Amino acid sequence: VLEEDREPDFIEVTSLQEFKDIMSMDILTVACFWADDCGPCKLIEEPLKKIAEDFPDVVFALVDADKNPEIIKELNVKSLPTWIIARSGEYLGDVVGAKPDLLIEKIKNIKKNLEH
Structure with a gap:
C-alpha cells in the first residue's frame, strides 16, 4: 500500500468536502498548503x-x-506555503510564506483569544 505517506501527525485532505468537514469541527485546525514544485x-x-x-x-x-x-x-x-487556521467552521487567521515563527505566534494568539 505504502502507508503513513506523510508524518502520522498530519492528516491529508483530498477534497474540498473533506476540508470543509474538518474545519467545521470544534477543534483548532491548521491546514498547510504545499506542493511538489x-x-x-x-x-x-x-x-x-x-x-x-x-x-x-x-x-x-x-x-x-x-x-x-x-x-x-x-x-x-495564491502562494505556497500557506497555513489557514480555523475552528468550528470559523476561519481565525492565516500565514503566507515559509514563516514558521509567525505560525507559532498566530497559533498562541488565537488560543489565548479562545480562552478569552
Whole structure:
C-alpha cells in the first residue's frame, strides 16, 4: 500500500468536502498548503513537524495544491506555503510564506483569544 505517506501527525485532505468537514469541527485546525514544485515548502517541512509536536491540541492537515485546485480556488490561495487556521467552521487567521515563527505566534494568539 505504502502507508503513513506523510508524518502520522498530519492528516491529508483530498477534497474540498473533506476540508470543509474538518474545519467545521470544534477543534483548532491548521491546514498547510504545499506542493511538489515548491522550494519554500521543502524547507519548512521539519519545523512544521516540530510545531505539530508543540501543539498536540491542534489538528494539522496537509493539502496538496497540485491535487486540490478547487480548494486552492475556494480559499483564494495564491502562494505556497500557506497555513489557514480555523475552528468550528470559523476561519481565525492565516500565514503566507515559509514563516514558521509567525505560525507559532498566530497559533498562541488565537488560543489565548479562545480562552478569552
